[PDB]
Amino acid sequence: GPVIRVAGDSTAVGEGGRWMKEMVEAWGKKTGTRVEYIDSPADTNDRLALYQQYWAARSPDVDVYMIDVIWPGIVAPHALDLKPYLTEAELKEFFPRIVQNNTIRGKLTSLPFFTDAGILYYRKDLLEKYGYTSPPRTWNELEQMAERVMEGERRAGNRDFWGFVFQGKPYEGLTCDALEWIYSHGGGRIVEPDGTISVNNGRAALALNRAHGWVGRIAPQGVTSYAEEEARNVWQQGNSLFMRNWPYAYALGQAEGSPIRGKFGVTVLPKASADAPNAATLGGWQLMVSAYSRYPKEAVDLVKYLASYEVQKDNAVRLSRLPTRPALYTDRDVLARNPWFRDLLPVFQNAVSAPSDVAGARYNQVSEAIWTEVHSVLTGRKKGEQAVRDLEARIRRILRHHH
């Protein structure tokens, strides 16, 4: 019979690839359908380039892809329209915001699978050790706490200890981190939903200068090459007071044998001042049936299974990844394992999107300009003032004539 082939997630990032292959094999076994899992690189922008090779070729060699929240506008021609396969009731079991994100010119490109939001991880043991009763609410507090804890821990002999780790590598994750910095300083959304390129302002510049101020000071010098896993590994070994990262790192940090099990909490990222908005960049992954699949009916059945209540539940319980079904956020088992899903639900609801809707199919070019200009500030090559001016000019060129 048919072999249903899936490219989604990565064995190079936590347990995602392993768990994904597990779920796909379970569907295979339950339905009597042969399946194959194709692995992907860690970073989303590398995955896009890979999958683009299959799409350009109209390749039938992958039936189902896991696609980023930022991709629907790019990948829509390569997606089978799922709308005819779901009832209105079925489709309403997902968050409307994500279904809308995934719907391009009326085409439902993909089902919501898991959502994502950037959050602050913090070592509760260390805050208590150094006299702090709450995680930081402002970036200045984060810096003050990081400096004091680092001084103490370095003095006690942990030469590997840092204050803060994050994603500073030149790739999509830096765009995510940087949107949070900018937005949390009152600097806007880089490109606003209405099309306005707003990033050339003093608040955005300050946010970038502040981040440069971390590098080699409270954050490792090598943070400028860190993606999600590099940051997680320093944190997870016990060597960072703070980390910015996504939900998936929670379950990994709690696993038996983690040096930091039971020593950490999560909260909203800090912000410049009390009246700035809270920033959490909206991430997440969706399930797309290939327009080039020879087996659309079977592939849709697999995508419905993967997006089902019980598979999303497993993803939440075992991998601490955020459901795209509101009903899971009241599930007793999801909540007992991850109580912070309830505490931070409003953070997740107010998460801020990168400018993929407004940039559409040119989003990957916009984002590359963003991470390259931000990176040049993190390296000390440019000041924030110059970088946001240069970034405005690049984005203007990229989006000229885009409506």
Q: How many residues can be counted in the chain?
A: 403
| Cβ proximity of 232 and 252 under 8 Å | yes
Q: How far is the CB of 174 from ligand GLC (least distance, A)?
A: 8
The neighbour count for residue 397, using CB atoms within 10 Å, is 10
User: Contact with ligand GLC (CB under 6 A): which of 9, 63, 172, 180?
Assistant: 172
Which C-beta is closer to ligand GLC: that of 28 or that of 355?
355
Strands 282-289 and 64-68: what pairing? antiparallel
Residue 195 is given by DSSP the state S
Min separation Cβ 282 and ligand GLC, Å = 7
Say how far apart CA 166 and CA 315 lie, in whole Å: 24
Q: Under rule CB under 6 A, which residues in 183-212 are in contact with ligand GLC?
A: none
246 binds ligand GLC (CB under 6 A): yes
Q: Which of residues 272-311 bind ligand GLC (CB under 6 A)?
A: 283-285
17 binds ligand GLC (CB under 6 A): no
> Binding to ligand GLC (CB under 6 A): which residues in 58-97?
68-70
Q: Can you read off the two tokens belonging to residue 294?
A: 């020879």
44 binds ligand GLC (CB under 6 A): yes
At closest approach, how far in Å is the CB of 205 from ligand GLC? 23
Residue 349: other Cβ atoms inside 10 A: 14
Q: Are 188 and 201 in contact (CB under 8 A)?
A: yes
Nearest-angstrom CA–CA distance, 139 and 8 = 35
| Beta strands 322-323; 240-245: pairing state | unpaired
From the list 26-34, 169-177, 217-225, 286-294, the region that binds ligand GLC by CB under 6 A is 169-177
Is 331 one of the binding residues for ligand GLC (CB under 6 A)?
no
Give residue 176's identity as a one-letter amino acid code: C
Q: Which of 221, 241, 237 is nearest to 229 (CA)?
A: 237
Q: Whose Cβ is closer to ligand GLC: residue 281's or residue 293's?
A: 281
User: By CB under 6 A, is residue 168 in contact with ligand GLC?
Assistant: no
Contact pattern from residue 211 through residue 230 relative to ligand GLC, giving x for each residue in contact according to CB under 6 A and a dash for the rest: -----------------x--
**Residues interacting with ligand GLC, by CB under 6 A?**
44, 68-70, 116, 172-173, 176, 228, 246, 283-285
